[PDB]
Amino acid sequence: MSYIPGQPVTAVVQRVEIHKLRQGENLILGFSIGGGIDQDPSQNPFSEDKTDKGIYVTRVSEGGPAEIAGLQIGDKIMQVNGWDMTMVTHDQARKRLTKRSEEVVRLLVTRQSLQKAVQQSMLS
Numbered sequence: 001m002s003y004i005p006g007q008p009v010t011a012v013v014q015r016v017e018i019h020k021l022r023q024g025e026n027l028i029l030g031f032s033i034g035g036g037i038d039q040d041p042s043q044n045p046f047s048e049d050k051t052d053k054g055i056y057v058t059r060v061s062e063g064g065p066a067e068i069a070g071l072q073i074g075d076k077i078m079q080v081n082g083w084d085m086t087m088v089t090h091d092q093a094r095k096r097l098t099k100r101s102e103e104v105v106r107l108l109v110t111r112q113s114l115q116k117a118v119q120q121s122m123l124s
Contacts, residue, residue, distance in 0.1 A: 001074055002049070007113065011050050013078060016107035018069035020100070027100045030064020031071050033057045038089030050076040050110040055085035055093040057109065071107065072114035079108030 020027035035055020044052055055077040060066045077085050080093040081102055097105055 003113070005113075009050065011076070011110045011112040014070060014109055014111045016066065016069040016071045016109050017104060018065040019104045020102050021065045022100075025100060027098065027102070027105070028064070029097055029105070030061040030066035030068075031057045031073070032059030033077070033094060033097075034090050035077055035085055035088070035093050036090030037087045038091055050112065052076075053087040054078065055080060055088060055090065057107075065105075066107075069107070070111075071109060072111055072116070074114060075112070076110040077107055078110055079106070081106045 018030075021030060022028075033055065035051070035057075037053040039053075041053050046052075057066075057071055057073060057075045057077060060071045060073045077093065079085050080088075080096040081099070083093065083096055085093050085108070096102070097107065
């Protein structure tokens with residue numbers, strides 16, 4: 001899950017924005033997640049990666065809205081719905097993205113090397 005051929009720390013900050021997936025009364029997030037100063041900070045007393053005390057996605061559902069926006073199962077989220085995730089409790093970020101009122105769901109992610117559907121281009 002962790003390998004940097006020529007991009008240690010210098011990851012690609014991308015934007016995930018998808019319209020909440022309503023279910024009866026609630027909204028479904030097509031990803032699993034833990035990011036928090038709320039979480040266990042005792043594994044990265046300065047940094048662990050681009051994750052640190054930030055928020056970061058632990059999954060994404062195949063075919064769910066998170067994948068449509070481009071979330072990648074293991075990505076360090078820098079923001080949730082306009083909030084700032086660098087040192088914010090898991091629940092702070094989770095509560096925002098589980099607001100059944102956010103017609104659209106905003107996620108700022110730092111995406112490192114979870115390359116999918118990359119198109120080849122032969123330069124000769």
